[PDB]
């Protein structure tokens, strides 16, 4: 347990956007208290996460410390300005945060952080419709922002306009063909959206996600259940009926195999057997 | 007439603490004034997706009927602090689960009252009558042993047991994580 090890752990926990605020805030506090001078400016990015975790963790005592250090180091910085905006939003102080973001925008119009923070404020206030409208307007100038695209898709899913969410996930897959998570989420959204005309797309995209990653057993039994629903639908044609029955049988075989592997990996009561007891039904 | 065990409340607090930033949901199973003997969590964050909910409910029904329980309640904790009313997902899920047994009623973890010790009962129980869902009396007693629930929730949260808690979503990530989470059950037994 050396400061390099926790530094690498924090770097990994930053590269993939985790939100285990307690662990990251504890590690960051240890780093900035014990090994603050053991390494150079690489802690400064840490000083971002550490405060955000604090706002997530509720421990506001060190949020002021980190903010004051960053401000005294970086006067008139748009990143630190957004960070102050988040500090203000931590206590639902929305008017001052909005004014600060407007000042940032009038100082620099190409900044994208201020728009995202202001729409985060709007969605925190519960005005979902105006938040969706603001995101739609913001994308009209910044088509291609994958993060905002996925956030808009998630908001549409929450508000249950599954057509727009499916469209946004389609264009997200356009952006990133090789991410199986997007394919799985789009298959789920399409399955939830409607019937056979969308069930076919859902099962095709579930198969695509399985091809892109064999371990996504979530999408595995998602494909299984989509095929089963297609089978149970009277409108399915005879050739479609036998095709989806074959797909369901293959998926069931894969599910029994996967749960047998789950069995050999652990050592306990055979709940996985109970699990395939469900498949036999 | 909705009654849930103290372990159900501690599981509620555990799942709320595991993913504080994401809205969560799940089911509560009971044997055939109904007493919710046990509970089970499922997913977090995005909750409007159907396929996971369907596969979940099917697995809950299989596991419960294999071991004589039946699913009899639905819980959902929303993301927003100032939000305490059910959404479409919660309403439809509660209506569908209530189709089997009329005694099934919805419960929602009011995150506004979520504290370290859980001074006041966070859960609010909603009943379906006249084809409408409406809350019960807040002044009613909800847990079977309120001081016991308070102390066990405080001990579990202070023991950092929420990180070890596993819901259905982690089972989906990897089956090696036990979705039946008997670990919190043995911790409850040891604490009691």
């Amino acid at each position: 347990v050396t400061w390099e090890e926790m530094r690498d752990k924090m770097r990994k926990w930053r590269e993939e956007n985790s939100r285990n605020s307690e662990q990251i805030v504890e590690v960051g506090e240890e780093l900035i208290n014990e090994y603050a001078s053991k390494l150079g400016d690489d802690i400064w990015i840490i000083y971002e996460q550490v405060m955000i975790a604090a706002l997530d963790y509720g421990r506001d005592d060190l949020a002021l410390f980190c903010l004051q250090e960053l401000r005294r180091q970086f006067p008139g910085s748009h990143r630190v300005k957004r960070l102050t905006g988040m500090r203000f939003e931590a206590m639902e102080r929305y008017d001052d945060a909005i004014q600060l973001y407007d000042r940032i925008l009038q100082e620099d119009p190409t900044n994208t952080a201020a728009r995202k923070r202001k729409i985060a404020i709007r969605k925190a206030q519960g005005k979902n419709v105006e938040a969706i409208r603001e995101l739609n307007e913001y994308l009209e100038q910044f088509v291609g922002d994958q993060e905002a695209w996925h956030e808009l898709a998630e908001l549409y899913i929450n508000e249950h306009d599954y057509a727009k969410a499916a469209f946004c996930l389609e264009e997200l897959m356009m952006t990133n063909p090789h991410n199986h998570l997007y394919c799985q989420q789009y298959a789920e959204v399409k399955y939830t959206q409607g019937g056979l005309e969308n069930l076919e797309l859902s099962r095709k995209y579930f198969a695509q996600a399985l091809k892109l990653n064999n371990r996504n057993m979530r999408a595995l039994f998602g494909l299984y259940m989509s095929a089963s629903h297609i089978a149970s639908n009277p409108k399915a044609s005879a050739k479609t009926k036998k095709d989806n029955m074959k797909y369901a049988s293959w998926a069931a075989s894969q599910i029994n195999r996967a749960y047998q592997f789950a069995g050999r990996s652990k050592k306990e009561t055979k709940y996985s057997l109970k699990a395939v007891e469900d498949m036999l039904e | 007439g909705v009654k849930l065990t103290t372990q159900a409340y501690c599981k509620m607090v555990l799942h709320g603490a595991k993913y504080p930033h994401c809205a969560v949901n799940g089911l509560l199973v009971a044997e055939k004034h109904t007493l919710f003997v046990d509970c089970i969590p499922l997913f977090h964050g995005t909750l409007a997706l159907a396929p996971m909910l369907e596969v979940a409910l099917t697995l809950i029904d299989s596991w419960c009927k294999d071991h004589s329980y039946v699913i009899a309640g639905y819980y959902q904790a929303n993301e927003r602090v100032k939000d305490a009313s059910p959404n479409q997902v919660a309403e439809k899920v509660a209506s569908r689960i209530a189709e089997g047994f009329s005694d099934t009623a919805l419960i929602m973890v009011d995150n506004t009252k979520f504290t370290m010790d859980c001074v006041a009962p966070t859960i609010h129980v909603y009943e379906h009558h006249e084809n409408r869902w409406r809350c019960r009396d807040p002044h009613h007693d909800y847990c079977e042993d309120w001081p016991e629930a308070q102390r066990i929730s405080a001990s579990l949260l202070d023991s950092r047991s929420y990180e070890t808690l596993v819901d259905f979503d982690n089972h989906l990530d990897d089956i090696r994580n036990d979705w039946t989470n008997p670990e919190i059950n043995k911790a409850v037994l040891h604490l009691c």
């Binding site: 088509v143 249950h160 939830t192 629903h229 | 909910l53 029904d61």
Partner: peptide
């Protein structure tokens, strides 16, 4: 299926790139 819950229903400017009408142009 005893758990076939439907989550669709009410659909509420329009998101950029969206076009509701199913056009057969090819």
């Amino acid at each position: 299926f005893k758990w076939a819950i439907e989550l669709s229903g009410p659909g509420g400017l329009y998101p950029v790139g969206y076009l509701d009408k199913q056009v057969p142009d090819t």
